[PDB]
Amino acid sequence: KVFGRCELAAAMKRHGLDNYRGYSLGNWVCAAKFESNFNTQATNRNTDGSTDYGILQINSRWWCNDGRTPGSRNLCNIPCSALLSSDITASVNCAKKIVSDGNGMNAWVAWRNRCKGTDVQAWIRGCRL
């Protein structure tokens, strides 16, 4: 499923991402935008045997298991396929866990490059949520 910006904003708010560990809603919306363009089925193969899955492109080397990645750590203890669902529940739970490490949202390079230290509220500014 390809979310509408505001549609996803409301979804992420519903799933408690706004102000989660000091990160306003916009941060997550921005990251979703640059990572997958709000597409839950987005996937990306990497040079190692890993793959990034979902609306937030979570890597199978450390966060999820796809039964076909060498040196998998499966920190989110979740099948990577769960991160491709139209229901963002799984991707959100894993995201919340990733950001709970010492480096927070800095885990997402795209967030640092195009969201970190910017007026992220712009992303939700305009939605009636």
Epitope: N77, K97, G102
Partner: antibody, heavy 113, light 109 residues
């Protein structure tokens, strides 16, 4: 199936250091974030802090000064160190996964002279 | 300021077969970042509901959670004999994580 077990001195004297060990079996200590939670008398729970998969940590502010959480990857265990204890540190200590899906049996540590 | 979770009633006596609702209130909005735990005497805490209403595979279906923001509720559809003990809520929205004072589910006679 991942399992946890707390071990360490059951008695610590005032002003000394409290040390506890959590042994991770079934999986690697590097496969999750792990925490230390204590229960004071009167059913009062306190989330002392946690250590990530990377080794970084977060400590409860009320403890940020006396607490330190470390891990040993070759042994699959992580530890809790709490300095300058007083009788108020007497409690049941538990180690658990960050997700709260796994918990040790917990171990009582009493601070007394 | 650390988030304070207030649970009520502190204690609740019911007859097995009856249904009950347990309240947990947060001093600040925490969206859906509220988790429910059960702890029976001499046993370690067990996670029942995560993120306000998400079910945990392996937990009896009589247990369910609802609420959002600052008001949460743990519901037990027809309490069973092995369900008595302590119930605590915990927020993970902000560090430090904090627990509510707990509600004691006891047997009515």
């Amino acid at each position: 199936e991942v399992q946890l077990q707390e071990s360490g001195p059951s008695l610590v004297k005032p002003s000394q250091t409290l040390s506890l060990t959590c042994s991770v079996t079934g999986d690697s200590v590097t496969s999750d974030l792990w925490s230390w939670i204590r229960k004071f008398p009167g059913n009062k729970l306190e989330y002392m802090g946690y250590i990530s998969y990377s080794g970084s940590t977060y400590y409860h502010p009320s403890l940020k000064s006396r607490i330190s959480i470390t891990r040993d990857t070759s042994k699959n265990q992580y530890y809790l160190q709490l300095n300058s204890v007083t009788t108020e540190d007497t409690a049941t200590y538990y180690c658990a996964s960050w997700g709260g899906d796994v918990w040790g049996a917990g171990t009582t540590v009493t601070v007394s002279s | 300021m650390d988030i304070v979770l207030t649970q009520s009633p502190a204690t609740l006596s019911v007859t097995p077969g009856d249904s009950v609702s347990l309240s947990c209130r947060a001093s600040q909005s925490i969206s859906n970042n509220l988790h429910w735990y059960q702890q029976k005497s001499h046993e370690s805490p067990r996670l029942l509901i995560k993120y306000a209403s998400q079910s945990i595979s392996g937990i009896p279906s009589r247990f369910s959670g609802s609420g959002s923001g600052t008001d949460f509720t743990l519901s037990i559809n027809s309490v069973e004999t092995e369900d008595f003990g302590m119930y605590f809520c915990q927020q993970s929205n902000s560090w430090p994580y904090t627990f509510g004072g707990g509600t004691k589910l006891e047997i009515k006679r």
